[PDB]
From a paper:
We mapped putative VP motifs in all these proteins and assessed their binding affinities to the COP1 WD40 domain. We could detect binding for most of the peptide motifs in ITC assays, with dissociation constants in the mid‐micromolar range. Next, we obtained crystal structures for the different peptides bound to COP1 (1.3–2.0 Å resolution, see Tables EV1 and EV2, and EV4) to compare their peptide binding modes. We found that all peptides bind in a similar configuration with the VP forming the center of the binding site (r.m.s.d. between the different peptides range from ~ 0.3 to 1.5 Å, comparing 5 or 6 corresponding Cα atoms). Chemically diverse amino acids (Tyr/Arg/Gln) map to the −3 and −2 position and often deeply insert into the COP1 binding cleft, acting as anchor residues. C Superposition of the VP peptide binding modes of the HY5 (green), COL3 (orange), and STO (gray) peptides depicted in ball‐and‐stick representation when bound to the COP1 WD40 domain as observed in their respective X‐ray crystal structures. As for UVR8, COP1Lys422Ala showed increased binding affinity for some peptides such as those representing the COL3287–294 and CO366–373 VP motifs, while it reduced binding to others, such as to CRY1544–552 and CRY2527–535. These observations may be rationalized by an enlarged VP‐binding pocket in the COP1Lys422Ala mutant, increasing accessibility for the COL3Phe288 anchor residue, and potentially abolishing interactions with CRY1Asp545.
The COP1 E3 ubiquitin ligase is a central signaling hub that integrates inputs from plant light‐sensing photoreceptors. COP1 contains an N‐terminal zinc finger, a central coiled‐coil, and a C‐terminal WD40 domain, which is essential for proper COP1 function (Deng et al, 1992; McNellis et al, 1994). COP1 regulates gene expression and plays a central role as a repressor of photomorphogenesis by directly modulating the stability of transcription factors that control the expression of light‐regulated genes.
Author numbering:
A (entry chain B): 287 to 294
B (entry chain A): 351 to 363, 372 to 406, 411 to 630, 639 to 675
Write the structure that this text describes.
């Protein structure tokens, strides 16, 4: 979650 | 050709998502999962550890940006969506901007119009703020999550927007009807955008590449490869000559902008793949940089022969 790049 | 290694010159022994120097490269600030903005004196750190300021926050922090004219002011973006401007002398929040409806990933203070700051969010909006006004000055409704926003270093009329749609959207804020140009090439979300100069823009992506772009002639220039970045925000920092980024192998990578493979790297039991570099920041155009990783360790590194 923290520091994880999003997706669409 | 003058450098082959990164030397550790100082260390401060969780995840730090942002590490940034103030205007004069005298203080630096860290922020992330611990809901605490810490300010350190760079010279003290190199010559020794204790922060000189600590500001508690309500939410986890994604990004910091110091004001370029009011040297004691710093902005943060947080996982609640709030964009805060802080006075590190008084420890008080000066502005709390609350229009974003989801986590804000990025905030950037303009160098040339220092009261202007821009933020981007999972709510798919870019918001431009003025520190003398409570409501946003410009709102750009985009189709996809915004991971990073950055002002052009030479003019507050241009911003680069790194989007989860895999593109960099380059806007002239005087006419947001259409971006000036949308740069395609990355195969995954664009996690960072950073300017080397008025005309040179770099980007990072979870396709394990960095890319260099010409924002004057709207051209791709170069793709950089070697590091591992498929999941996390691992940091990007650039100066006139060099790009540095983290890796999901607990290594920092440095690229010269003219060379596609790294000129050097530094590794910060558990596999390398269990920790990642989470934040990086050059000390302006010098070979010194700040780095932090997912354990919360901070290292000052210097390019060396």
């Amino acid at each position: 979650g923290f520091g994880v790049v999003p997706s669409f | 050709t003058r450098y082959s290694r990164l030397r550790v010159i100082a260390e401060i022994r969780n995840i730090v998502s942002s590490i940034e120097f103030d205007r004069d490269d005298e203080l630096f600030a860290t922020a992330g999962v611990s809901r605490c903005i810490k300010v350190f004196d760079f010279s003290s750190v190199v010559n020794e550890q204790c922060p000189i300021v600590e500001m508690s926050t309500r939410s986890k922090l994604s990004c910091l940006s110091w004001n370029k004219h009011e040297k004691n002011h710093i902005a943060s973006s947080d996982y609640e969506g709030i964009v805060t401007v802080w006075d590190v002398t008084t420890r008080q929040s000066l502005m709390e901007y609350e229009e974003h409806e989801k986590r804000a990933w990025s905030v950037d203070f303009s160098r040339t119009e220092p009261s202007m700051l821009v933020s981007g969010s999972d709510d798919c909006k870019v918001k431009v703020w003025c520190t003398r006004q409570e409501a946003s000055v410009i709102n750009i409704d985009m189709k996809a999550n915004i991971c990073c926003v950055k002002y052009n270093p030479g003019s507050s009329n241009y911003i680069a927007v790194g989007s989860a749609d895999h593109h960099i959207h380059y806007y002239d804020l005087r006419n947001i009807s259409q971006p000036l140009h949308v740069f395609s090439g990355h195969k995954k979300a664009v996690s960072y955008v950073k300017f080397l100069s008025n005309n040179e823009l770099a980007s990072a992506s979870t396709d394990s590449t960095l890319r260099l772009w010409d924002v004057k002639d709207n051209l791709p220039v170069r793709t950089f490869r070697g590091h591992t970045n498929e999941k996390n925000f691992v940091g990007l920092t650039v100066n006139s000559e060099y790009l540095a980024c983290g890796s999901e192998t607990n290594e920092v990578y440095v690229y010269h902008k003219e060379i596609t493979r790294p000129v050097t790297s530094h590794r910060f039991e558990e596999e390398a793949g269990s920790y990642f570099i989470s934040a990086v920041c050059w000390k302006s155009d010098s070979p010194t940089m700040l780095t932090a990783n997912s354990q919360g360790t901070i290292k000052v590194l210097v390019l060396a022969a």
